[PDB]
Amino acid sequence: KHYDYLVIGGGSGGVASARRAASYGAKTLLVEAKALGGTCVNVGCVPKKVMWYASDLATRVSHANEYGLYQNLPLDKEHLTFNWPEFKQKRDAYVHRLNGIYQKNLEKEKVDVVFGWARFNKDGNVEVQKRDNTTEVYSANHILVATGGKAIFPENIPGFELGTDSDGFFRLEEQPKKVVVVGAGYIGIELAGVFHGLGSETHLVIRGETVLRKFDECIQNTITDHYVKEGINVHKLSKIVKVEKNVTDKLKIHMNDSKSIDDVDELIWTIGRKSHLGMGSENVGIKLNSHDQIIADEYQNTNVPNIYSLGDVVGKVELTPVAIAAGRKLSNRLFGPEKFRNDKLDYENVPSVIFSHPEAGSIGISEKEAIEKYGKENIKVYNSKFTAMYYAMLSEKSPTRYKIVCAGPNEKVVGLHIVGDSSAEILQGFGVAIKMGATKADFDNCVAIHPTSAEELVTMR
Amino acid sequence: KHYDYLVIGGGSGGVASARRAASYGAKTLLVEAKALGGTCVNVGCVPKKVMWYASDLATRVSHANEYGLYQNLPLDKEHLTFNWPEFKQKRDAYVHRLNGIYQKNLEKEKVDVVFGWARFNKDGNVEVQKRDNTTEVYSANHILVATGGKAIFPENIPGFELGTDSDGFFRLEEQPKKVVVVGAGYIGIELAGVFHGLGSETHLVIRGETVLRKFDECIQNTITDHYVKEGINVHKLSKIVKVEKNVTDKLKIHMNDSKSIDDVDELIWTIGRKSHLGMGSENVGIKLNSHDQIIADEYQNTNVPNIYSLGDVVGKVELTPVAIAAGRKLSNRLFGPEKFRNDKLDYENVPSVIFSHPEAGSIGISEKEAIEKYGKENIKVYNSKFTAMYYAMLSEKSPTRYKIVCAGPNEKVVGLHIVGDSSAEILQGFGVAIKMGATKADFDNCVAIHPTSAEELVTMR
Numbered sequence: 001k002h003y004d005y006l007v008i009g010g011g012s013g014g015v016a017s018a019r020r021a022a023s024y025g026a027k028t029l030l031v032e033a034k035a036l037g038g039t040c041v042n043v044g045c046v047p048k049k050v051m052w053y054a055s056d057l058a059t060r061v062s063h064a065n066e067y068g069l070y071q072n073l074p075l076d077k078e079h080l081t082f083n084w085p086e087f088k089q090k091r092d093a094y095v096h097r098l099n100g101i102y103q104k105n106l107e108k109e110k111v112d113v114v115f116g117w118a119r120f121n122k123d124g125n126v127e128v129q130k131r132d133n134t135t136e137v138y139s140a141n142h143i144l145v146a147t148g149g150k151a152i153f154p155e156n157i158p159g160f161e162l163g164t165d166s167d168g169f170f171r172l173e174e175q176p177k178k179v180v181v182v183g184a185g186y187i188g189i190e191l192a193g194v195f196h197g198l199g200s201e202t203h204l205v206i207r208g209e210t211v212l213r214k215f216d217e218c219i220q221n222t223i224t225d226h227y228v229k230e231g232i233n234v235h236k237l238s239k240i241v242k243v244e245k246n247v248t249d250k251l252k253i254h255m256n257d258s259k260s261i262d263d264v265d266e267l268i269w270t271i272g273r274k275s276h277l278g279m280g281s282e283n284v285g286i287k288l289n290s291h292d293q294i295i296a297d298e299y300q301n302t303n304v305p306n307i308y309s310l311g312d313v314v315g316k317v318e319l320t321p322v323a324i325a326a327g328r329k330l331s332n333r334l335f336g337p338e339k340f341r342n343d344k345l346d347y348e349n350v351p352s353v354i355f356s357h358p359e360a361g362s363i364g365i366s367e368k369e370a371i372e373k374y375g376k377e378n379i380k381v382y383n384s385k386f387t388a389m390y391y392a393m394l395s396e397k398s399p400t401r402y403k404i405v406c407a408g409p410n411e412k413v414v415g416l417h418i419v420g421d422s423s424a425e426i427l428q429g430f431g432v433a434i435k436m437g438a439t440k441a442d443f444d445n446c447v448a449i450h451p452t453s454a455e456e457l458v459t460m461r
Numbered sequence: 462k463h464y465d466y467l468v469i470g471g472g473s474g475g476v477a478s479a480r481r482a483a484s485y486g487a488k489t490l491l492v493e494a495k496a497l498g499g500t501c502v503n504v505g506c507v508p509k510k511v512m513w514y515a516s517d518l519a520t521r522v523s524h525a526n527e528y529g530l531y532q533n534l535p536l537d538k539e540h541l542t543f544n545w546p547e548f549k550q551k552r553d554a555y556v557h558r559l560n561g562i563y564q565k566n567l568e569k570e571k572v573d574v575v576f577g578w579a580r581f582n583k584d585g586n587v588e589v590q591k592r593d594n595t596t597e598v599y600s601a602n603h604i605l606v607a608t609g610g611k612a613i614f615p616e617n618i619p620g621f622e623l624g625t626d627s628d629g630f631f632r633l634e635e636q637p638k639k640v641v642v643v644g645a646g647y648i649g650i651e652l653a654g655v656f657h658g659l660g661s662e663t664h665l666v667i668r669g670e671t672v673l674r675k676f677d678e679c680i681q682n683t684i685t686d687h688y689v690k691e692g693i694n695v696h697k698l699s700k701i702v703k704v705e706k707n708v709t710d711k712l713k714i715h716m717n718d719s720k721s722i723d724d725v726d727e728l729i730w731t732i733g734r735k736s737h738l739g740m741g742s743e744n745v746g747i748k749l750n751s752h753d754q755i756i757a758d759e760y761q762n763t764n765v766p767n768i769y770s771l772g773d774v775v776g777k778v779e780l781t782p783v784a785i786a787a788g789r790k791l792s793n794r795l796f797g798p799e800k801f802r803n804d805k806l807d808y809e810n811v812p813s814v815i816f817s818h819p820e821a822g823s824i825g826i827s828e829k830e831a832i833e834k835y836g837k838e839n840i841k842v843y844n845s846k847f848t849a850m851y852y853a854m855l856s857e858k859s860p861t862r863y864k865i866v867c868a869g870p871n872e873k874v875v876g877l878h879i880v881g882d883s884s885a886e887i888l889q890g891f892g893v894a895i896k897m898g899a900t901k902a903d904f905d906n907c908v909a910i911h912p913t914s915a916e917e918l919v920t921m922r
């Protein structure tokens with residue numbers, strides 16, 4: 001009936017926060033409507049990366065013959081086959097095991113877990129409609145709303161329902177021969193890369209001239225250009241204006257430039273996500289912003305006493321590690337030692353990665369943002385363009401592009417943006433240095449590791 | 462016939478130093494007896510990593526079927542083939558191409574290049590026997606000796622001449638079916654990994670219980686154990702006492718414990734390197750240590766006025782980036798602006814990598830060294846053991862092992878030691894942070910990147 005901490009949402013932030021609270025001794029209840037691990041584990045980071053690994057390997061196999069390997073076998077694009085149904089099962093099995101582990105951990109850390117739809121009632125308590133069909137009402141001293149987000153559909157577009165969202169991607173049981181992905185965000189860029197690496201004719205529809213418009217132009221241009229060069233059909237300056245189903249059962253996409261894409265087996269909208277508001281938040285007076293996101297201050301406090309919110313539902317830096325960290329720091333503050341009274345997450349200079357092909361990474365501000373904030377006169381930029389040594393033995397090539405953005409007379413690194421193989425793994429350490437206030441001189445103050453790609457970052461202009 | 466700077470040795474340090482000196486306006490002469498780029502380019506870092514890419518890809522292809530790819534093709538260990546002769550040709554082509562680029566750069570940066578054996582005469586000048594069949598004598602105000610090293614042969618062992626060294630590895634025209642590598646050093650560990658990944662029955666002979674005994678025990682144990690598990694035959698507590706050749710043309714290697722390895726096609730000694738002397742060191746008074754290495758102070762000064770030395774010939778931290786950096790800083794000091802009159806390389810906390818399978822990385826001191834230096838009571842160690850997500854879809858597995866060694870009440874990071882896929886690329890950034898004086902709290906002060914392996918380093922114990 002009554003708890004110290006009740007968490008609505010079994011995702012990245014909810015799970016982390018519940019666990020941290022319980023670690024400090026706090027009768028904690030966690031309510032999840034679907035599966036533990038939320039978006040990341042079930043239809044996000046995890047299954048996307050597994051598919052990424054498959055796509056990545058498909059490409060690598062096409063290099064083997066040149067690398068002198070398996071020369072009696074035709075390891076080329078033409079003979080590429082991918083057993084989508086079987087791989088799908090293994091992927092689902094892995095995700096299912098992770099759910100089990102999560103449920104196991106929460107029980108062992110003494111967090112009570114209930115499955116059902118949670119909602120606020122007028123009294124300020126939480127009604128949970130259970131999966132055993134009962135409906136229980138619970139009370140608590142502290143309540144965290146970490147319900148995450150959900151894909152946006154372009155409901156103004158006739159035929160829009162004929163396509164799915166990223167969740168739909170993960171439900172696909174067969175591989176589409178021809179796929180159209182809409183949106184220049186990282187989710188779409190990643191899915192498009194995966195589809196193409198696995199053999200599907202792949203189309204990516206974007207409003208502007210370049211993908212990944214939230215990132216530095218170096219990332220935008222390199223990924224845009226490489227996607228086009230490798231065979232991903234990028235429709236620039238385009239918006240879908242109508243979708244229809246044929247004789248054949250395939251879709252036909254109608255663009256605003258009057259062009260079209262015919263014989264499409266699958267259409268996926270990846271045009272943003274919105275806050276997953278299903279609770280009775282109105283029943284407790286939780287203020288929403290003009291984008292229907294829950295408002296939260298720097299301590300994750302909503303406007304309502306003893307109600308907190310974080311993660312995608314708030315919508316500030318929508319990444320799994322961020323929610324986890326905010327979740328943990330909130331629990332430190334509410335239930336931890338006195339030294340954590342003012343604990344909060346620093347949301348600036350969070351590094352992030354795009355599992356495109358090639359991968360990309362970014363932390364800090366873009367060159368354009370740096371010029372705006374500090375003025376041209378005070379921005380120094382370092383660039384490096386090269387092809388990794390791995391491609392020396394190959395006719396096919398992939399770009400590596402490193403950009404360091406510096407501000408002030410000490411050349412403080414305010415942005416680091418990279419494109420190329422291994423970027424995902426390279427960035428973390430540099431992230432630690434940048435959070436330490438690293439300058440260009442600091443990057444230069446570590447001897448290089450040879451031969452590597454990362455090495456280029458400590459020996460530029 | 463007279464120069465500002467004469468550099469003996471066209472390798473990592475020599476080339477870097479010559480170019481930096483010439484950049485400042487200095488009539489510079491570079492003398493190389495073989496090929497520009499030295500050990501690294503011709504018989505070191507470069508061709509070893511190219512071969513590494515081959516073995517790495519060979520392993521990767523054996524995971525493709527599991528990853529649902531090319532399932533009509535038998536992509537297993539049993540069907541592995543490697544066209545060693547053809548790949549050798551491409552590898553040499555790439556190296557030859559790098560030689561050309563170096564010659565091009567140097568003559569573009571106004572360094573005179575002469576091929577020949579250089580030696581000091583009694584006058585203190587340098588006579589060079591050329592390929593003109595000429596023999597000129599040159600004088601200079603400043604002389605750098607950067608002649609590198611060479612493999613040690615165990616001349617006390619009968620039949621020792623029946624094996625080669627790492628140079629010989631790169632001369633191999635055909636793949637040996639059964640190969641023996643001797644020594645626990647990083648060069649032999651790498652070569653053993655390559656041989657095994659490419660299908661040869663591989664044997665590694667070591668004096669102790671573990672490989673890589675200069676590194677932290679975590680690296681030693683993990684690589685040792687994985688090599689055994691893999692199928693690399695590691696002969697521990699052993700030493701070769703006799704080598705012989707049969708009828709057959711194959712070798713029989715006799716051990717000190719009365720065991721044997723017969724039908725061996727190739728034997729490679731990788732038991733250390735020694736300074737490559739042979740110039741007229743004696744004619745000029747250059748002092749050598751008890752290991753026959755040239756002595757050099759913190760400014761790379763030998764005991765002789767206007768004669769400097771660095772790189773493998775001195776033998777302090779034998780890596781390409783180190784020689785390059787020392788070469789550059791020397792030129793800054795000798796010919797650069799007033800600013801650099803006390804420029805010198807910091808040889809502490811130089812990061813280094815081992816291209817084993819899996820790769821490993823290390824910077825700073827081992828746990829044992831820390832305890833010895835700071836005392837048990839002041840050392841805290843963080844460990845993390847896990848299998849990368851890539852293996853989730855596979856039956857075969859590979860370990861990832863991260864160790865952070867901390868000293869003092871601020872938990873200053875004094876050692877970072879890692880084993881696992883991507884380690885080579887992960888380490889650099891962390892190296893920058895350690896040279897900044899990173900503490901554990903600093904590692905923790907950057908938000909994680911999910912999903913990656915590096916992530917584990919900023920979220921530990």
Ligand SMILES: Cc1cc2nc3c(=O)[nH]c(=O)nc-3n(C[C@H](O)[C@H](O)[C@H](O)COP(=O)(O)OP(=O)(O)OC[C@H]3O[C@@H](n4cnc5c(N)ncnc54)[C@H](O)[C@@H]3O)c2cc1C
Binds near residue numbers: 010911
């Ligand atoms: C395709 C895709 C790929 C991504 N890849 C990455 C990546 O590689 N790296 C990364 O850092 N981030 C990635 N993200 C983002 C990441 O998934 C999110 O930032 C993260 O999941 C947010 O966690 P959260 O706790 O805010 O909410 P979520 O993780 O979304 O979990 C919210 C939970 O609340 C539950 N819930 C909602 N309402 C109720 C209710 N009323 N009662 C009970 N339960 C309820 C939902 O079932 C859900 O389980 C990806 C996202 C997507 C969509």
Ligand SMILES: Cc1cc2nc3c(=O)[nH]c(=O)nc-3n(C[C@H](O)[C@H](O)[C@H](O)COP(=O)(O)OP(=O)(O)OC[C@H]3O[C@@H](n4cnc5c(N)ncnc54)[C@H](O)[C@@H]3O)c2cc1C
Binds near residue numbers: 505608
């Ligand atoms: C198998 C192997 C793998 C390695 N892998 C790596 C790696 O991955 N990363 C890394 O950082 N390091 C690696 N190293 C180490 C690296 O190669 C050396 O540290 C580096 O080459 C040292 O450069 P140097 O300038 O000191 O001498 P070198 O690079 O050895 O060059 C010395 C030059 O001097 C010339 N010379 C000698 N005497 C004379 C003379 N009398 N007249 C004219 N010329 C002369 C030689 O021909 C040679 O070209 C590896 C080494 C080996 C052997």
Ligand SMILES: *SC[C@H](NC(=O)CC[C@H](N)C(=O)O)C(=O)NCC(=O)O
Binds near residue numbers: 219221222383384403
């Ligand atoms: S990825 C190569 C880099 N390109 C960019 O940085 C583009 C930046 C935008 N154009 C900006 O916002 O202005 C790069 O290194 N460019 C170097 C160059 O000289 O163009």
Ligand SMILES: *SC[C@H](NC(=O)CC[C@H](N)C(=O)O)C(=O)NCC(=O)O
Binds near residue numbers: 683828844862864
């Ligand atoms: S790679 C795993 C780590 N092992 C070691 O550090 C071995 C060290 C030596 N054998 C030694 O200290 O004698 C590891 O995680 N060790 C954890 C530990 O508690 O030692």
Ligand SMILES: *[C@@H]1O[C@H](CO)[C@@H](O)[C@H](O)[C@H]1NC(C)=O
Binds near residue numbers: 208256
């Ligand atoms: C189609 O829509 C895009 C996206 O807004 C726009 O840039 C482009 O100009 C439009 N094409 C037309 C109207 O010709």
Ligand SMILES: *[C@@H]1O[C@H](CO)[C@@H](O)[C@H](O)[C@H]1NC(C)=O
Binds near residue numbers: 668669698699700718
């Ligand atoms: C063989 O040599 C190794 C290395 O010195 C030593 O450890 C071992 O004890 C020797 N074995 C015997 C039986 O002498």
